[PDB]
Design a binder for this molecule. Sequence first.
Ligand code: SF4
Ligand SMILES: [Zn+2]
Ligand SMILES: [Zn+2]
Lengths: 714, 149, 98
Amino acid sequence: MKLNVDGLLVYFPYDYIYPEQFSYMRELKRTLDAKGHGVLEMPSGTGKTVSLLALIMAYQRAYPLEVTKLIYCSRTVPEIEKVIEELRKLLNFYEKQEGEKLPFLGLALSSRKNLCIHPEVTPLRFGKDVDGKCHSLTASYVRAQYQHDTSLPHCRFYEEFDAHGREVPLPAGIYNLDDLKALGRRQGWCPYFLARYSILHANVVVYSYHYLLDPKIADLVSKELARKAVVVFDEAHNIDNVCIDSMSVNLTRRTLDRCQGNLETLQKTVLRIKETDEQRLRDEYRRLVEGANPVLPDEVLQEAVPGSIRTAEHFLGFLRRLLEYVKWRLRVQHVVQESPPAFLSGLAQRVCIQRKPLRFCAERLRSLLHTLEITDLADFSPLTLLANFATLVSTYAKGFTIIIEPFDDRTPTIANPILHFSCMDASLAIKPVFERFQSVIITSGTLSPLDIYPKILDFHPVTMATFTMTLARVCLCPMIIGRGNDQVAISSKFETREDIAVIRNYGNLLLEMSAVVPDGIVAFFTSYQYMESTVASWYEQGILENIQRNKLLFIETQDGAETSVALEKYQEACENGRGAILLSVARGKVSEGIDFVHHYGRAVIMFGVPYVYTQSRILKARLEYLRDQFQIRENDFLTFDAMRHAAQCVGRAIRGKTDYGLMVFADKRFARGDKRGKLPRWIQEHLTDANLNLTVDEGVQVAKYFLRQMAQPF
Amino acid sequence: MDDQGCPRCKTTKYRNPSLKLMVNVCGHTLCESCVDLLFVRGAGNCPECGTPLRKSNFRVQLFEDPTVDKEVEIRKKVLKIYNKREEDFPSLREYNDFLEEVEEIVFNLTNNVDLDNTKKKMEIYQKENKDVIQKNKLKLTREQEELEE
Amino acid sequence: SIAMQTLKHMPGHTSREVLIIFSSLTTCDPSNIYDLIKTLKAAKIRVSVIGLSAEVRVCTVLARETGGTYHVILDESHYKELLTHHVSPPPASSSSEC
Ligand code: SF4
Ligand SMILES: [Zn+2]
Ligand SMILES: [Zn+2]
């Protein structure tokens, strides 16, 4: 299937493409031709990936100099595996068409924890542990000692890679993570480091955001080599939250105590080092005078001189001083306090800690800790976190804020206070991506309206188009139910949350919808506490028992183990005729991680508009700062945060292969024009005024009829 | 306030955290109910150590670490010296070399004999007090006032 | 299982067929039905479900794997058509033997 695109001719593996695919390809080619960053939305979970990859490959063939390589990022490794599968299929199709191999390379990066071949680190699954063990095995000290070949466990894979892969790079091919593990085992090399080196000469590289956003690890692999590369973020509508998380650092009392203990161990190790080997490790002082990774981005990062902290004892005392200041500032009992610049000024005044020497604290920590030949960085990781916070605060506070919480939420009195350093704007941390890369395409599904995104992230988009899925059959038939059998408002307002009548309306709607809907249904609440309250009310009444009789019921919990077990049983229930009703939370990690396909989550129920609690002070900074700068109304951003989240958690049923399914929102708020307008275009256009505010019974009847229509073949 | 208590009357913490540590030349934890002790007999002598104090050597502090108390006080005194701004020296190394010597002086004063430090500080006094100490001391108020607003 | 017990001893030449008029989408069974699907395929018993007001996934896989056809009632008139269509003998496939 060769498509004569306006720009050029583009190959395509599958037989047919919908008109939305034509529109997507033409808009994407327009953006690439303009060589300017832009954002676009595509409904389908799958199909957009193949269209995007094919268009990028064809554009690379036409103008190889224009684009050096493609950097395609996905939320999670399980998801990016499907992307690499799609890319492998596309490459096989293109190779068959051409008749021969071409110099094209495509690979996926992942954590050493996820992929590695060392038996010692295999049993351990904790990422910091894998990082520390690998650092110990690959340490420059361990490498030098391996040169001596003394009796000591040395990781042969990295040494063999240094010997061989450095000389010879991999010719070409596509390697999934699992297949790359096998390749590393066969060749006695690192599946991780081999891909890391191939990044220098790779046409396509795929990895999650935290491999491309956080300055600590993103920069090293996203160096200026890709000066003009097509960087693409997929389903990255929750990009602001992850970009903020890449900067926010949380300091707790327990973490601070662990830091103090680690610092004591550091002092003891320094004394032992002084008595054992002093001159050779002192040479570090000379190289320092000449002049865990830094959190400072490219331009913000500075390397002039370490500062007044030039020796191990001096640096240790500096950390003692700063840790004492943080300890006391956290121990203070008072209302939540915000102080971005005032915190730095007060630190400098109270404990005599100048911001410039504080700036290089984390970098000097890395160097000095390397000198100590520690067993691993896992033990001292809390200290490195505190050092990263210490350097960040002295680095900048223009678009940041230090929040102190002596008392935690959900606890009238708790002896574990927490100090947050949550960011307020993601533009600060995502600026390097936009500036360095010629064009970035934020391709997303279920995207709340694009107009806000340029305001939140400071960039000038080239194209702003919303693509609506078009099929010969109406795959999706969304509806909103606001009126119950009692013709009573069913809005899940904070003041209306306690309403037993509203809870009863929700329960009855779920009962009837489970009675009619086939096997497999997922209901998303607004919070764990609200979900528990509704479940308890239904349990006190007989509605819950009737729902249990009609279909099996499963519930989500904060604990990941129970969540995984419940979802595993839910899948088997969906396969069998019992069916299942999975209650979950919109913010739950399960909602974002899981993907619902044919005969999975057939009818997506949304109980109440997803709104975060109006007491969490972090969101207060994040929100009022957006009001002050970029001029976004607080209500506007709040409703946007609700609609984007709801679209994320309701857009799964249309994953791909044209699998029918209905999305019912049991809240009259969605019927409001603003919510509908902010809803994604593809869902909204299907939505109509006739079914906009169906009663519970009317919605049930129309759902039954729509399921009848979708049951029959094409 | 998280400390279990004063080494002798460690009662006074599980009493309540209103009281604050009292810094002394001994760098030595104390509480006000114990400051009444130290006044009432001895009048400026550490209970265990017996370190003499001129007038009670008492000032309010809220840092549980006695080493941090001594280090912070010594740094407060030292900052009065070597307060010249960085831009006064065009040399790249000299920006932080003098700060290195300053912190070395602080660590020296914390534990080792301060006689050499005092003699050196007299040497630096005779030169700095003329211009640099006065100028930076006067400019401190100006810069602090501008920074506060 | 009842149908399989009765049809197991039936002659090989005749075509064993089952038409499940499924009404309630739920299926509470003592044992997993996917295992029974294997025995049904081994016994070459055609099973063609006719669902009512539901596109049941387990019955979809049952029909397509066992060789039968799956349908859902659009209305009473279409129900008449479905059953009248099922009246006629089904074509013999490769697994079928005469
Ligand atoms: S050096 Fe390679 S093989 Fe050894 S632990 Fe690290 S990633 Fe695994
Ligand atoms: Zn006392
Ligand atoms: Zn004492």
